[PDB]
Amino acid sequence: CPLMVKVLDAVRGSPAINVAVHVFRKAADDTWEPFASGKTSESGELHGLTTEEEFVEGIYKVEIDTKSYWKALGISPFHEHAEVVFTANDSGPRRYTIAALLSPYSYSTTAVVTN
Amino acid sequence: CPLMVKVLDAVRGSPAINVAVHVFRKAADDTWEPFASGKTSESGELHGLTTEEEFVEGIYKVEIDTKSYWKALGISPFHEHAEVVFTANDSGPRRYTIAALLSPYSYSTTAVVTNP
Amino acid sequence: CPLMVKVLDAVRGSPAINVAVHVFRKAADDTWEPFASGKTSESGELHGLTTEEEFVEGIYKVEIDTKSYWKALGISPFHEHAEVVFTANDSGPRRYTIAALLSPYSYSTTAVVTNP
Amino acid sequence: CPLMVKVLDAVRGSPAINVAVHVFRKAADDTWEPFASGKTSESGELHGLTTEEEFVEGIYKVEIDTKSYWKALGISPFHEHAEVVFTANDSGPRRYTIAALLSPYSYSTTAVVTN
Ligand SMILES: O=[N+]([O-])c1ccc(O)c([N+](=O)[O-])c1
Ligand SMILES: O=[N+]([O-])c1ccc(O)c([N+](=O)[O-])c1
Predict the structure, then answer these.
(1) Do the bridges between strand B36-39 and strand B3-9 make them parallel or antiparallel, or are there none, so unpaired?
(2) Nearest Cβ partner of C10 from A10, A12, A13?
(3) What CATH code would you report for C1-116?
(4) Is Secreted one of the keywords UniProt gives this record (chains B, C)?
(5) What is A1-115's CATH number?
(6) Residue of A66, A95, C16, D22 with fewest CB within 10 Å of its CB?
């Protein structure tokens, strides 16, 4: 799995469970086309989004559906979703972990790219 | 000024200066969209993007051009840009500060929302 | 004002008001330490902690009393406080803004350091 | 292992490897007494700091030696170290993960507490 998404909850100090995540790849005409999606597990992680074969170089967008997450918890959120937009580059063997740490009015996100 | 954008640099410990910012508003057709744009000052702030009159209720996207920022400093960062998407003015007019703290492979963003 | 502390609330999207802040400076004996203290204003800022004269070179610790903050709002947070430890003025006088963005189980902190 | 420390590097987008971490427990006289220490692994993680038996309720401080980390990379840092101070509470079965995401002039830290 060249791509993994991990989401944490900064209010409860826990994995953010059952968060919907949609990934898109930018198409030639500049539009975003659906690529992969899923919901985070009990560990706050989403594995198996794509394969090495499918995850070619290109520009990708990872949308984390934070608004629904907070709504299900009865908490008023600011953002519609969190978005992470990046270019995947074939610089030797690499795995991409996109992490996000969520609060109602703020989030942090980072990439951990390893071989 | 009901909308202000502030950007900081976590590598240098300074305001992030000359960062391009583009704001979009979702249209009736569900497309993004252009609404306003500008660049951060020497204080890392961008004021005067809009007016109370023009900044009506809607879904807005603030795109902060982080890649251009890092590349102008000779660094190859991870993200294309930082995107902040939110509904504004759904309970009447508010003042919004959208802040972002930037590193080459990471960013954080928060909003401070006040009522005049 | 060579030292300013700013605190934001990531739950409410607001300045963190009335947050107690204690600053310490490492002494010759290697103990912390008292140096200055105060509380954030309605803007979430704490100015006037010290003067250019008193704020000499040294190792400083800014302790932000986050637990007291969250408990006064009826929340049980993870951390006792947020601690920011840094050497100041080692290359001559600078102006320091120490910022912290607070959530019940998390915080971020950054410094903006400028030269007058 | 009731306590794990994880450190990430926001400049390189990688685990922060070989970072020294010192844990202290607050003693009756209010002083901090050494409790456990180690260095993060290639995954940026530090496991095996303590046992269930030893990790009783109390106030703990986790010091992450960020200054030396940045110095070894030739990068000028702001902080002497990052410090995380918290009370451990016996509210049923719990594991504490203290995470920190490091930049030269900033860091974020969060707790993930799970059963
Ligand atoms: O996964 N993490 O450990 C972790 C910690 C702090 C963070 O701020 C983030 N982040 O920005 O996504 C991730
Ligand atoms: O505005 N600030 O001072 C400030 C501090 C820390 C932060 O993490 C952020 N942020 O996420 O945008 C902003």
Answers:
(1) unpaired
(2) A10
(3) 2.60.40.180
(4) yes
(5) 2.60.40.180
(6) A95
